[PDB]
Swiss-Prot record, chains A, B:
It is found in: Mitochondrion matrix. Belongs to the citrate synthase family. The gene is CS. It catalyses: oxaloacetate + acetyl-CoA + H2O = citrate + CoA + H(+). This is Citrate synthase, mitochondrial. It comes from Gallus gallus (Chicken). Homodimer. CDD domains: ScCit1-2_like (cd06105). Its EC number is 2.3.3.1. It is an enzyme of class 2 (transferase). One of its GO terms (biological process) is citrate metabolic process. Key enzyme of the Krebs tricarboxylic acid cycle which catalyzes the synthesis of citrate from acetyl coenzyme A and oxaloacetate. One of its GO terms (cellular component) is mitochondrial matrix.
Amino acid sequence: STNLKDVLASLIPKEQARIKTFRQQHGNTAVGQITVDMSYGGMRGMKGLIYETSVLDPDEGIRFRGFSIPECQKLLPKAGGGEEPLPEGLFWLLVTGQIPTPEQVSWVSKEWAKRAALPSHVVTMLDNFPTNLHPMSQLSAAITALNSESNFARAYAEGINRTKYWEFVYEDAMDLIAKLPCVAAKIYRNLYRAGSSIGAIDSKLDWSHNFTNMLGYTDPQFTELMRLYLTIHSDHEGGNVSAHTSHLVGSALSDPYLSFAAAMNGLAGPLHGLANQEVLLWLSQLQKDLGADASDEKLRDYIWNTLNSGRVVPGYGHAVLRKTDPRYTCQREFALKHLPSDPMFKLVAQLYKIVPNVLLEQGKAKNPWPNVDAHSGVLLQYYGMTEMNYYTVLFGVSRALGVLAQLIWSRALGFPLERPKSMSTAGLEKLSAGG
Amino acid sequence: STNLKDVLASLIPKEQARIKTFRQQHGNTAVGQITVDMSYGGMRGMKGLIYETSVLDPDEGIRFRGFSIPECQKLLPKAGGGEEPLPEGLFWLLVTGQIPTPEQVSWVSKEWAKRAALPSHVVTMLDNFPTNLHPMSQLSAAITALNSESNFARAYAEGINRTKYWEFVYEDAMDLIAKLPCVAAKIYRNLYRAGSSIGAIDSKLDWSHNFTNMLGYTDPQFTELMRLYLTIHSDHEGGNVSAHTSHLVGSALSDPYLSFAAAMNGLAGPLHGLANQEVLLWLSQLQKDLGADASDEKLRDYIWNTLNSGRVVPGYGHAVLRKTDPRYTCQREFALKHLPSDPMFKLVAQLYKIVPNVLLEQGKAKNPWPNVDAHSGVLLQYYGMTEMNYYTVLFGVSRALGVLAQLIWSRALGFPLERPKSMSTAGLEKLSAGG
Ligand SMILES: CC(C)(COP(=O)(O)OP(=O)(O)OC[C@H]1O[C@@H](n2cnc3c(N)ncnc32)[C@H](O)[C@@H]1OP(=O)(O)O)[C@@H](O)C(=O)NCCC(=O)NCCC[N+](=O)[O-]
Ligand SMILES: CC(C)(COP(=O)(O)OP(=O)(O)OC[C@H]1O[C@@H](n2cnc3c(N)ncnc32)[C@H](O)[C@@H]1OP(=O)(O)O)[C@@H](O)C(=O)NCCC(=O)NCCC[N+](=O)[O-]
């Protein structure tokens, strides 16, 4: 009765027409300029991509198809007896642009349970990886290796007409989402629960719940945390490194598996998703040097040492946001409700009072406020997930939702190869006169 | 006596100063505008990046630090008794901006021989991969898995001051270049020469020569072809999918292994590097349908069928070039000298007379001329490398030279995170009025 694929089939042609006409009227309209400083500055401030699923406001934070986090929390379907939004529902919203019914949500849950299966070659590879190989590397290689299963890759090789790309992208996307938790959980078990098994998928549970069972966690509040985590880490517009990388690779017609694996390699960078892990490592050294209950002046000192040593303070700052990330606020509120007295949380809370002032004093950061990565690990640690090198894997799993939702649209809308023009310093100087 | 690392140590500070001053004077100078059509069109025509190593001219083709291909052919050091430029020399040029001496070239050759070694976990993974897993996927996963060895990753984790990033990038870059041929050759042997071994590196040979020996080819002309191939596939400015992907991932501080693997995933796309393989598959179906010696009218028909079926004609067209790719011309000239009567070459030559006219007649392609991918496989096939699904691996190996040369510079120059702003259609319409 419910079939997302049938819903998209109706939506596609209309969006195609609307963009066609808009472009007819305003294709040559200028929306901005490019300066020397923007080229040298990693395109900061350049409007360079169309990405439909979410849009980030520098002051207000992210909107998912027009809704803020508080709105989603409020509108999206929850688990029975639950309080946090189910990521399945967030997926529906991103893809269709409409708030799903609970019935629609349960269909997604079933679909993902049905498609969850790992090929033996992938199981083998994971089982043979050494324990010093970083979890994000293990994740990316496994996803790359899953491409033997790609339906898009297969149809392409068979000569499918370009107009049908979206259909095969959608299949691969739902298959990949389905398989992610099995990949991620097998890594977790092999690394940290050596000799145990992930077990099997229960077609009757929500995606987050099967995931936490495979991770081996029983706490019900942990399940709720996982639901919220996976929902809020989902998408963050198109120019962030992971999304942009998936977009750019997907534009060459690489299949969703290859596109998502490349994105993971970008998420593994210390300036991107790896910050969630870095925050915890920095806090551990903190508590270690200073010891649990530090004074304000000592925290300052410690922050300064980092800055003075030519390092960044993880979890603070943003390329676009200019105010406190609502994703951070959202986490804080969860902590205040569930683990108000945890000492680490307490430390994280104290840094909120300090860090921004030091960054401001330093005068370099454009945004001295915290970002999502500053509050995520702390929540995880409380529930027993102390393996900090694994944190980014959770972010990867969530991020699949948003990048794949857009990927289906990029192909539906016929977006071409992403290929800007580059310039050398010497050539740019000439273009101007030099300096 | 020769030490590239010492050469870079002197060059870095000067370039830093020159860019600093230029930016002081012209940072706010506008170099272009952004239109609606550019955002929807994968940034076509947008000047968006600084990339130092090579610059592409739409009419004249690529220049490597200011030199054209014919110039390189002429200036770069050759093998003893050789005619084609050694890629080692091309690497020196890209990195320093100066033409190396043969003595400098031999140092690179030795250095790469010395650093060539594979960790057992990587050997194991390759040996367990199934034969239906595409060679490019196998390559990317192995490179990702090599990241356990990253020196950059390690130094970062130790808190290295940002000013020294370049030094560790350079080490990883030389290590990765060194190891590429062993990875690539082991895949080749496992897939197509099952039961045999790649053997060992001869510290006395050039990089291309150790590579062809590991691939198992004895023909001396094959060695010369490999030298030229690896030289010309090296770099193609910064906005091409593979280079741009390495640049973007590297900008988040992911190590060179992760950055290069992500790039490979972009090179594996049918619209990018996979075209070299696609051309051969299309030619095989051609010769199969029509049979070896086709007439012009029949080739036309065959081209039309492709176009009419909603597919691209591989090997023709470009996002930036507007005339015949000099890399194509360069290949043709090699063919004319060495394999003038090969029937496939002959076919490729015939298509040159036909394809462009049909594309022009169709009126959609901006560039109806051939690109590099249209002529590369044919050369390979002649020498016995008939495994067309493997062709893109060779391109990956070459491409490492250029993207890694730039990567060292990106970190030396302190380029920040690549993070443009995205927009939804709805938001863009609002920005204007709509349409
Ligand atoms: C997010 C980030 C990369 C944004 O980069 P940009 O847009 O280039 O930041 P911005 O324009 O503020 O840079 C101005 C200067 O302040 C410096 N600065 C910015 N944020 C920080 C920070 N948290 N700690 C120290 N220095 C900083 C920045 O490195 C730059 O210095 P320099 O000119 O010497 O290169 C940067 O804020 C950062 O490195 N933050 C710390 C790492 C982090 O938390 N990453 C996670 C972000 C979220 N995610 O991606 O999952
Ligand atoms: C290289 C390529 C992606 C450039 O893309 P663009 O800059 O978007 O090309 P362009 O501006 O000419 O596109 C105009 C129209 O012509 C179409 N067109 C362009 N080249 C081709 C071609 N070779 N065969 C059929 N149609 C083509 C193109 O798809 C587009 O159609 P639509 O509007 O319906 O989307 C495109 O020429 C192509 O698909 N070529 C064939 C694949 C190929 O040879 N790739 C290898 C390139 C080199 N490399 O990357 O290693």
